[PDB]
Amino acid sequence: DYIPEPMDLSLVDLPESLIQLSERIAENVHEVWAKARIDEGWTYGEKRDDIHKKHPCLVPYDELPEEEKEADRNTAMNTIKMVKKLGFRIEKED
């Protein structure tokens, strides 16, 4: 029986200017991931198949369902919130 105990991020505040770019960050995070898989012989498939190297998320980011892009933008902001929580400043450059 699995019960996740994440560290709480709900009070971590990021620059609005950073949240505004979360779509661009998720797309590129997706693209970097897809390049690596395709460079190692993965191809599009209906379900995740490690033994044959097939994955359904190997399509352009823009063609993903919006619920997935939503998950991906959340993960991108959760990552940076965890950075700030581990004690790093995040500031827009002048």
Q: Which residues bind a second copy (CB under 8 A)?
A: 2-7, 9, 15, 18, 21, 24-25, 28-29, 31-36, 38, 44, 47-48, 56, 58-60, 71, 74-76, 78-80, 82-83, 86-94
Is 50 among the annotated ligand-binding positions? yes
Furthest C-alpha separation in the chain: 49
Q: How far apart are CA 64 and CA 70, in angstroms?
A: 10
The residue from 24, 75, 85, 90 that contacts ligand CFF (CB under 6 A) is: 75
Amino acid in the structure at residue 78: N
Coil, strand or helix: which one is 71? Answer: helix
Binding residue numbers for Mg(2+): 50
